[PDB]
């Protein structure tokens, strides 16, 4: 995922009104407002964009190279039965008390 000369595709928000809610999602691009004067959607003196980009390359140290993260989450609402683990087996002998 790291290409020489900067790979500016992956963004990460670093300005927001208040912290998120668990498992919630926010994709807006409304210009932040830290001061007391309303912005009217123009960057500049106190009125910045909310999205930056990781510029991943190859000559970085550990702790700055791009890591890929996946998370699994289960939840058992009300279903009688659903996807379970895999089954296994043995054989099928005959004429024996088993």
């Amino acid at each position: 995922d790291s290409k020489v000369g900067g790979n500016y595709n992956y963004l990460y928000r670093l300005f927001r009104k208040s912290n998120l809610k668990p498992f919630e999602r926010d994709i807006s691009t409304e210009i932040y407002q830290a001061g007391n004067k309303p912005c009217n959607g123009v960057a500049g003196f106190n009125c910045y964009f909310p999205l930056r980009s990781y510029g991943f390359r190859p000559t970085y140290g550990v702790g700055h190279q791009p890591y890929r993260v996946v998370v699994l989450s289960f939840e058992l609402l009300h279903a009688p039965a659903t996807v379970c683990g895999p089954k296994k087996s043995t054989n099928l002998v005959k004429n024996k008390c088993v």
Binding site: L14, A34, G35, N46, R52, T59, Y60, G61, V62
Partner: protein, 597 residues
């Protein structure tokens, strides 16, 4: 919007952008330095241009936040560092005039050409040969020529430019609520309102003039010894109650007396410690020496190398014709991407330089967590200070015979120890009078005490009074001798090389008093200890986030620089010099002249 968040909330953005851009610029630069081509200069100049323009725009923007409504210390310090106008407070045409005068001064210094009176066709530059003539020749006439020439052709051109340079810099500094320029330099040691750790801009002069008073008892004896020894190579040229002629010290300006070791060795038939043939007889490459340095560093309790430093760094010069300036340097491109650029040879001197550079590498590894504007030493001095103690601790015979480069039965004696100690004190305590003299002279001429028709007379009476050296030829007021020193004609501060010499031995003693050492300090090692590593690392990781007078007190325990460790390091040499001068005359009389006889 608490009148401050508006500051921090900015600070963040700035932080990020800054770091990023800077990195782009720096990679660009390392490139050009390791692979000299014609296009790479262009590939790096525009990166530096974009970086400078971005930083000056952020500096012009940061002004809108006043500096008294801030309450948190770190954000206030970051803003105070960024909010600096620097130049560009002047009239616009005067700014271009200042750039022209600076660049013309630098050029006239760089491309100086002096030519013999017997052969004016082909002649000598400064760097190739002039230093060699002033260092290795032995005849009074040739040395006097090589000395008077460079000050008669490069000292005469620089005065009418330095005159305007002084007043321009003063008018610059006088717009930022400062009263002269020297104060704008001393402003690096300033700390305001931290309830006891404060350090006024003035008290630096007080310390300096208060710590130079305890050095003279040793410097006087060293001067007496060096003089009574130089009275052998040039018979009947020096007086036993006089000073030294400037053109007999060992280089162009008399800054390092290290080249006097050939004339003033105490025991000229007992060679010092030197691992140079034992290395090559073991087939050591450039990889092995750096592996040794990393092993030593990890032995005390510091982290390994970042595993990105063994593939990117350039430890040996490129085989084919690949012009890359061979001058060791430790790069911190940021983002945890550290590198070392140096053209290592298989010599114990490069073996010590590797330690001295990995010192800076470790010091940069430590504070990589602070905000980007606080990624430096505590002040200008701590960097090379914390660097040099590694080289001072890796050159002792103990650490050598514990690595496989000295014969196990190598028995050291007091003769070799006095030899080594004089070789050290010819460089360490030799440069301090010159350094303090030059810095005080510059502060004086900047504050306006010295009228501009009394520069050279004052400079020479100072060289007569403080350091103990006298000019060989009179010089009227069409000259300027100090403008012939690289750190003067290029607008470089020159007090760090005086605070470093003290911080060095303070750190040495403070550290290896934890390694439970018992003998004299000049054999002391910091290997295999873990308390020493912790004591050092609890200061390495602060950066600028705390006032330097706390970075000290967390290592040695004092709140200022103290010269006592230095004298405690040289006590054996001093005990010897007190005996070898039973019959000479210590000190010097400022009345003698080399021409008034």
């Amino acid at each position: 919007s608490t009148i401050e968040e508006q500051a921090k909330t900015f600070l963040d953005k700035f932080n990020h952008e800054a770091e990023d851009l800077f990195y782009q610029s720096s990679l660009a630069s390392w490139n050009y330095n390791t692979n000299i081509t014609e296009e790479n200069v262009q590939n790096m100049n525009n990166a530096g241009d974009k970086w400078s323009a971005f930083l000056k725009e952020q500096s012009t923007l940061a002004q809108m936040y006043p500096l008294q409504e801030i309450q948190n210390l770190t954000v206030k310090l970051q803003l105070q560092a960024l909010q600096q106008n620097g130049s560009s407070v002047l009239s616009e045409d005067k700014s271009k005039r200042l750039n022209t005068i600076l660049n013309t001064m630098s050029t006239i210094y760089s491309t100086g050409k002096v030519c013999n009176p017997d052969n004016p066709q082909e002649c000598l530059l400064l760097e190739p040969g002039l230093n060699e003539i002033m260092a290795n020749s032995l005849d009074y006439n040739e040395r006097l020529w090589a000395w008077e020439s460079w000050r008669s052709e490069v000292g005469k051109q620089l005065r009418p430019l330095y005159e305007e340079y002084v007043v321009l810099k003063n008018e610059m500094a006088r717009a930022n609520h400062y009263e002269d320029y020297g104060d704008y330099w001393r402003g690096d040691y300033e700390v305001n309102g931290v309830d006891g750790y404060d350090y006024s801009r003035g008290q630096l002069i007080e310390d300096v003039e208060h710590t130079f008073e305890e050095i003279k008892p040793l410097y006087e004896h060293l001067h007496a010894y060096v003089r009574a020894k130089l009275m052998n190579a040039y018979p009947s040229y020096i007086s036993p109650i006089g000073c030294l002629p400037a053109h007999l010290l060992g280089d162009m300006w008399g800054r390092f007396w290290t080249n006097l070791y050939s004339l003033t060795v105490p025991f000229g038939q007992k060679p010092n410690i030197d691992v140079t043939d034992a290395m090559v007889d073991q087939a050591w490459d450039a990889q092995r020496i750096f592996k040794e340095a990393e092993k030593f560093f990890v032995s005390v309790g510091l982290p390994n190398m970042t595993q990105g430093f063994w593939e990117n760094s350039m430890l040996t010069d490129p085989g084919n014709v690949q012009k890359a300036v061979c001058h060791p340097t430790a790069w911190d491109l940021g983002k945890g991407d550290f590198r070392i650029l140096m053209c290592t040879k298989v010599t114990m001197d490069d073996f010590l330089t590797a330690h001295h550079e990995m010192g800076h590498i470790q010091y940069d590894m430590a504070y990589a967590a602070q905000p980007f504007l606080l990624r430096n030493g505590a002040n200008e001095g701590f960097h090379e200070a914390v660097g040099e103690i590694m080289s001072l601790s890796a050159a002792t015979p103990k650490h050598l015979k514990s690595i496989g480069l000295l014969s196990p039965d190598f028995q050291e004696d007091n003769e070799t120890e006095i030899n080594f100690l004089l070789k050290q004190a010819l460089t360490i305590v030799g440069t301090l009078p010159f350094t303090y003299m030059l810095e005080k002279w510059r502060w004086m001429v900047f504050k306006g005490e010295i009228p501009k028709d009394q520069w050279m007379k004052k400079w020479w009476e100072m060289k007569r009074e403080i350091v103990g050296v006298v000019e060989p030829v009179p010089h009227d007021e069409t000259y300027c001798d100090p403008a012939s020193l690289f750190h003067v004609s290029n607008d470089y501060s020159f007090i760090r090389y005086y605070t470093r010499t003290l911080y060095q031995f303070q750190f040495q003693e403070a550290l290896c008093q934890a390694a439970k050492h018992e003998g004299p300090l000049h054999k002391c090692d910091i290997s295999n200890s873990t308390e020493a590593g912790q004591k050092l690392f609890n200061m390495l990781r602060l950066g600028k986030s705390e006032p330097w007078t706390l970075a000290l007190e967390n290592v040695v325990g004092a709140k200022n620089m103290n010269v006592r460790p230095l004298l405690n390091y040289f006590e054996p040499l001093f005990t010897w010099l007190k005996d070898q001068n039973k019959n000479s005359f210590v000190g010097w009389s400022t009345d003698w002249s080399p021409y008034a006889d």
